[PDB]
Symmetry: none
Subunit: 147 residues, 4 copies
């Protein structure tokens, strides 16, 4: 009859599910990721995805920017999880005083490129021959969103 999708800050009970999801795409993780700001997408009563944010560097001059990372579960594909997370982060950023969101995406990653551009991100960088992968060099883009 109905479905519900909730996005909220990560809670203690989430970590078993998060640790599990991060493997698909124990307490060391739980320690590591409490230095980290994570928001969680809950579909019904299951973890469907997360968005994680942190300033791109430790520089004070960088503290008004969030580098972002999205993870969507293999069991919650194609239900707008990615977009709901982006929308929520843009709203959180506005109140947090964050001026700018960014991330990097591999040139060959057409789906991510289209996703972020669809969500109003613009290309700021084309890093050519940027990453060495098994004998070849791969290009990378940086995308930005202005709150």
């Amino acid at each position: 009859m109905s479905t519900s999708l909730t996005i909220r800050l990560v809670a203690e009970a989430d970590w078993p599910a998060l640790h599990a999801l991060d493997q698909i795409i124990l307490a060391a993780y739980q320690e590591k990721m409490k230095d980290e700001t994570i928001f969680v997408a809950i579909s019904g009563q299951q973890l469907a995805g997360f968005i994680e944010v942190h300033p791109p560097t430790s520089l004070a001059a960088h503290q008004k920017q969030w580098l972002l990372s999205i993870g969507v579960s293999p069991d919650f594909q194609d239900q707008g999880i990615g977009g709901s997370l982006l929308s929520y982060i843009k709203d959180m950023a506005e109140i947090s005083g964050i001026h700018k969101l960014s991330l990097r995406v591999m040139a060959t990653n057409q789906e991510a490129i289209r996703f972020y551009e669809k969500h109003g991100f613009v290309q700021e960088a084309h890093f050519k021959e940027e990453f060495y992968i098994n004998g070849h060099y791969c290009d990378d883009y940086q995308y930005a969103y202005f709150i």
Copy 2:
């Protein structure tokens, strides 16, 4: 009389001073493991160039992020160009494919410098650095060995 070679224990008190113009035991403990090549005119430290990969990523280890410092008393002597040309040769043997660095949109003379020596623009980061109420642009420049 220009000799470029790697850093020695003799260079550290002279290198600490050129750093101030852009604690003495704190700096030698921060710069200890670092790859630093030093420029010597006569028997004086004219400048330096520091290189490290941009990140710890394995996929990034064929790239050098570079840092150049030139002494106030050694301007116009082409110290920068000699340092840079030296690192391009070193890169070629170290297996380094790409050189990069970032420069503030306002540092017009660093931009000119890097353009003059064959670097091309790869990034224009808008409103990137927050400085006293204002946002400032950054550029990334790259050189392909």
Copy 3:
């Protein structure tokens, strides 16, 4: 009178001599096939006395901080410490290049190379038994490593 030994990166001029040497240990065939390669040369007087060649053991990114090494010394420049001087130079070069580890493989029967590498601080990391097939028989091989 006086004797000089210099080690430096290979130069276009060296290639005729390098070609002739590798035939013991043409113009473009050897020269381009080895143009991408990182080769250093030992020059004794102004003749080519030997070389050391280095590259990562594989193309994997995770392997890019290691050099697999090969040394060649001329039959006309035996027993004058060329091998050791090349080894010393490469270890210093690796330190500036950010290279963490040197390695190579040596046939179990090659007692002199074993002694040479062990003398130069390389430690055995592998004993590959019955590893190479050679005219009816299987031969063992070691891997040696040096930690910069």
Copy 4:
């Protein structure tokens, strides 16, 4: 459970197994490769791949092995059946030695190969650079 070489019909499920452990790029990538697949009732349970470790003539009596097993088909002894199969195949192909490399941290692969008679030949220290840290590797061998 049936073990046979790869067929021209196995590629949509075999590529699918790879992503967990492009279909046009992958079929092309594994065109001429020696692969045996484990089938549990018209279902792809696992696979084993073998090639000489190098192009050296002197290495041609050796197989480097790679094993993959489906997430659905764990604990079914699929791994062991593939190995046992390749041990018998090696015997007739004239292969003298089987080998592979295993990360020091992959305890469960090490136990697996040890259980099936492989012995350690190498311990490569600080061998793989991974995000700022260096990681050990082992080589394991089986003698036919």
